[PDB]
């Protein structure tokens, strides 16, 4: 009786949200950006090839200096690369080789990683002993760790396969906030430029916008037909893009609270593993399972270019803070730095 | 044209390669096994004979190091983290023979054996395990002989029309799982009959892994 009445009210609320979104859908992003000129063909060449990983590379993250990056591979090593000279600055042996994510602190003093061990390990890169040591192990997730991002030297947000995202206090080792509401495994998260909000994509084909300070869900975004594997914030923080298993990338707007554009092609039938934006946000770079990375025109939904240099699935990619270069990792155990030429 | 400090950074990087190379060669001489199987199917009993989220177990048998990984605590969606084990030497799958006339505790309508067959077919035919040999264990064979005397196999397999004996019913179940192999070219299935007091379980895995090692060597050497 009471349970039946409540679930009927939920459907009415869902219908109310859908009607509100349809009311504000006066125009389309494709119609708005129909007048602008296309970006043409985006030609990027492999400037560097980072060799040394002996297994599949699952994650990489740029440092804020746009020169150092950390990559995680399932050979049990967390390697820090000097992308300018291909020198390995550090090599961090991981206790669990099933690492699924890695992060670089914006200060550059710490790196994070985590996988099937349900632990977010924090490593101190700046020690008087001259070696990288484990500073914290964040326990409390009951599923595998899928993504993690530093806010500062003391705060870090992690997503897990237990359908929850957690905000951690690194000094005390306790999660101050837990972000619940997903019904499936959360696969990735992206911090806003001001680090006051973050978006996450889960296996329930939904994306949620979270308030870091308050600890509650603000907006929920739907539309994907399968599990969301990648998510990234737009440079201004007012939009984000998701990459799912249905071979589609979609752009959502926080203020419009609805999808604006879909980035898919008929020849593309494989899943999408990683998405990222260029510095201006005009280029949406997405890694796919077909061993290639496609560059998308975010405003016009055109495939501007292809980064085809990997012998296996492109599992991760990232663009530098200055937009100068883009790195792609892959299951062929190679990281490639791409940028164009005049 | 490197500075005095750039040259020392390069030497440090090559020293890191000297340690990645040392660790990588040591890792390639070890065996990684993925232990799968439904609950109460003898999966935990196998660990008891071959002594967080993922439970990793090491054991040494005839100068060969095995790393067996148990992911039974991962209640998340299997298809998301299953590709992380693409490249393991072999998969040890445990199926309870005695769990053919029984039903699942939660569903209370789906047979336990059918659950394993669906689980086995989801693993054997998985795209990430295209060329990954599977070690199929048919545990509790002694208890199966008792049940087949009282409960006929026709409860689980209506199409079964064989004798009510262990020597014929057990082989029928073994063929059903091997029949689920949608790709009988890129992979093989090793079937073994275990028990609670069997001392030949670790030997079978050693033999099956040896065959996988030979197959991998043929591919690397270019013979395959």
């Amino acid at each position, epitope marked *: 009786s009471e349970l039946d009445q409540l679930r009927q009210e939920a459907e009415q609320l869902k219908n109310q949200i859908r009607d509100a979104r349809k009311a504000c859908a006066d125009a389309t992003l494709s119609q708005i950006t129909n007048n602008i000129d296309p970006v043409g063909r985006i030609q990027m060449r492999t400037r560097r090839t980072l060799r040394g990983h002996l297994a599949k590379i699952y994650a990489m993250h740029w440092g804020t200096d746009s*020169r*150092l990056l950390v990559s995680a591979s399932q050979d049990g090593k967390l390697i820090i690369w*000097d992308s300018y*000279t291909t*020198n390995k*600055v*550090h090599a961090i042996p991981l206790r669990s080789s099933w690492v699924m994510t890695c992060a670089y602190a914006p200060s*550059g003093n710490y790196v994070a990683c985590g996988g099937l061990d349900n632990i977010c390990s924090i490593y101190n890169l*700046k020690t*008087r*002993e*001259g*070696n990288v040591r484990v500073s914290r192990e964040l326990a409390g997730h009951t599923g595998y760790l899928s993504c993690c991002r530093f806010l500062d030297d003391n705060q870090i947000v992690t997503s897990s396969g237990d359908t929850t995202c957690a905000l951690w206090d690194i000094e005390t080792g306790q999660q101050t906030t837990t972000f619940t509401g997903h019904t499936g495994d959360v696969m990735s998260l992206s911090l806003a430029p001001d680090t006051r909000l973050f978006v996450s994509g889960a296996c329930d084909a939904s994306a949620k916008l979270w308030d870091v300070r308050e600890g509650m869900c603000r907006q929920t975004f739907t539309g994907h037909e399968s599990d969301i594997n990648a998510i990234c914030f737009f440079p201004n923080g007012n939009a984000f893009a998701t990459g799912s298993d249905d071979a589609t990338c979609r752009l959502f707007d926080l203020r419009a609270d609805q999808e604006l554009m879909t980035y898919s092609h008929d020849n593309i039938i494989c899943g999408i593993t990683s998405v990222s934006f260029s510095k201006s946000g005009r280029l949406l770079l997405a890694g796919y399972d077909d061993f290639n990375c496609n560059v998308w025109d975010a405003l016009k939904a055109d495939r501007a270019g292809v980064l085809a240099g990997h012998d296996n699935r492109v599992s991760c990619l990232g663009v530098t803070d200055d937009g100068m270069a883009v790195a792609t990792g892959s299951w062929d155990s190679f990281l490639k730095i791409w940028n164009g030429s005049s | *044209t490197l*500075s*005095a*400090e*750039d*040259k*020392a*950074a390069v*030497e*440090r990087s090559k*020293m890191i390669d*000297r340690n990645l190379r040392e660790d990588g060669e040591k890792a390639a001489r070890e065996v990684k096994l993925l232990l799968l199987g439904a609950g109460e199917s003898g999966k935990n009993t196998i660990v008891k004979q071959m002594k967080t989220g993922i439970v990793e177990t090491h054991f040494t048998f005839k100068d060969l190091h095995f790393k067996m990984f148990d992911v039974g605590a991962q209640r998340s969606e299997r298809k998301k983290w299953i590709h992380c084990f693409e490249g393991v030497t072999a998969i040890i799958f445990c199926v309870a023979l005695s769990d053919y006339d029984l039903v699942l505790a939660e569903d209370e309508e789906m047979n336990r054996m059918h659950a394993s067959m669906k689980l086995f077919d989801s693993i054997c035919n998985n795209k990430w395990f295209t060329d990954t040999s599977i070690i199929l264990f048919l545990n509790k064979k002694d208890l199966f002989e008792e049940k087949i005397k009282k409960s006929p196999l026709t409860i689980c397999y209506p199409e079964y029309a064989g004798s009510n004996t262990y020597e014929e019913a057990a082989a029928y179940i073994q063929c059903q799982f091997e029949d689920l192999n949608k790709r009988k070219d890129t992979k093989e299935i090793y079937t073994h009959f275990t028990c609670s007091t069997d001392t030949k379980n670790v030997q079978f895995v050693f033999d099956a892994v040896t065959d996988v090692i030979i197959k991998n060597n043929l591919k690397d050497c270019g013979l395959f």
Partner: single-chain antibody
Amino acid sequence: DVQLVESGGGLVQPGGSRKLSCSASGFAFSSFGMHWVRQAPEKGLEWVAYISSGSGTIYYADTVKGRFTISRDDPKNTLFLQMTSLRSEDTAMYYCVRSIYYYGSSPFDFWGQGTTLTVSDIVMTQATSSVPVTPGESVSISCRSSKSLLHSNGNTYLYWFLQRPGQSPQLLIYRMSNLASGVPDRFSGSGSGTAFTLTISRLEAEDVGVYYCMQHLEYPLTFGAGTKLEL
């Protein structure tokens, strides 16, 4: 804690041999390159030898090349300087210096307490030998080099060291601009090309000492004459 204790120094006869040892504790001795730097009595610092991490690279000073030998024992965390045919010019206090080299690192960050041995090329110039100073007053220290220390990669390999009376040299500024860890922010390094300046805003009593500028652009490493601040 990081520690470097030198031993083996003492009075030796001319033409003899002596063995210097440097025991390292509290840090990854095998991950650091190690230097020997001596200082003649009432004189400035003088680099002696260098051995890299893994013993792959060894450098010597021309004034001691062929007679001095530097080696390390990573399992025992000990650094060695084998010296043969000692001259009267070798009478100095020898210091053990660690320096790790990667992107963003600070070489020469920790120096040993040194040992005393008594026997019976880019030019760095510090013309100003002494500067009368008072507490709370901003002081500028000038250094010059024969060749431009700015490399094509953007780095300017100039190092600043402060040796307080009775203490070992301590790194203040590395690569001419970066402030070493544990050094107050009032110290700042500024320069361009061949002329450099060390600025000490709001000078305190602890800042009293001799300031040395070193070059790391190429070997041999050369020190300046030294600028002494006195009250």
